[PDB]
Amino acid sequence: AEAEFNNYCKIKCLKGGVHTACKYGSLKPNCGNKVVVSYGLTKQEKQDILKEHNDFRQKIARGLETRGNPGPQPPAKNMKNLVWNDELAYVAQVWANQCQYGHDTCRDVAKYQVGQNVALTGSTAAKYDDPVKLVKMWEDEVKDYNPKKKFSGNDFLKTGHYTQMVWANTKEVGCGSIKYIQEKWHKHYLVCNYGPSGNFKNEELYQTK
Numbered sequence: 001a002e003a004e005f006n007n008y009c010k011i012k013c014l015k016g017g018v019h020t021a022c023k024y025g026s027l028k029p030n031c032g033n034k035v036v037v038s039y040g041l042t043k044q045e046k047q048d049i050l051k052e053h054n055d056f057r058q059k060i061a062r063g064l065e066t067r068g069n070p071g072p073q074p075p076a077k078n079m080k081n082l083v084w085n086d087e088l089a090y091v092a093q094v095w096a097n098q099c100q101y102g103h104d105t106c107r108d109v110a111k112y113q114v115g116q117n118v119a120l121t122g123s124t125a126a127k128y129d130d131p132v133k134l135v136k137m138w139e140d141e142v143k144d145y146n147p148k149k150k151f152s153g154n155d156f157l158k159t160g161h162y163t164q165m166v167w168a169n170t171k172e173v174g175c176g177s178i179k180y181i182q183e184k185w186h187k188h189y190l191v192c193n194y195g196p197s198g199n200f201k202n203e204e205l206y207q208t209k
């Protein structure tokens with residue numbers, strides 16, 4: 001939470017926009033009339049999310065992901081595990097606390113531009129998916145990823161989450177979470193910020209082996 005003391009109002013994102021942590025200088029949920037059940041991630045949840053990201057990156061890197069359009073995904077020569085980043089997690093959490101599904105306009109930090117994956121599920125029952133389950137939703141996009149084509153040649157709407165997960169240049173991840181009730185839908189919102197950002201148009205996901 002130490003990051004809350006950084007002045008994000010001085011951060012400038014490539015496409016402009018007021019930084020999320022400048023817009024909201026509070027770490028307290030700000031969800032209109034929605035009923036916030038809980039917010040944040042436990043030490044174990046953060047570790048589980050990190051492990052899932054890394055187990056996935058390694059699966060891909062070792063040439064073990066058979067899914068694709070067509071599969072399999074090629075092995076990687078430069079795939080390193082991600083490490084959890086508290087600042088990314090903080091900014092992700094501030095965004096999550098707005099309960100506004102989608103991407104926030106400016107989330108970059110002092111060190112680099114930042115990418116982001118969001119996940120949301122709603123149920124009529126008072127139950128909330130495990131964070132890892134939401135992460136796997138992003139992974140499954142790999143079924144629609146065609147490695148015979150470069151990154152820009154693929155369908156971003158269908159694979160944009162997958163590509164950010166396996167972006168070789170991305171080295172850090174930090175996520176935020178919140179469970180709320182909106183018009184009787186029990187929703188779990190997961191926001192994960194990545195540093196440095198991935199999904200750059202003229203680049204490849206990772207160096208193939």
Ligand code: NA
Pocket residue numbers: 067068069070071143
């Ligand atoms: Na296939």
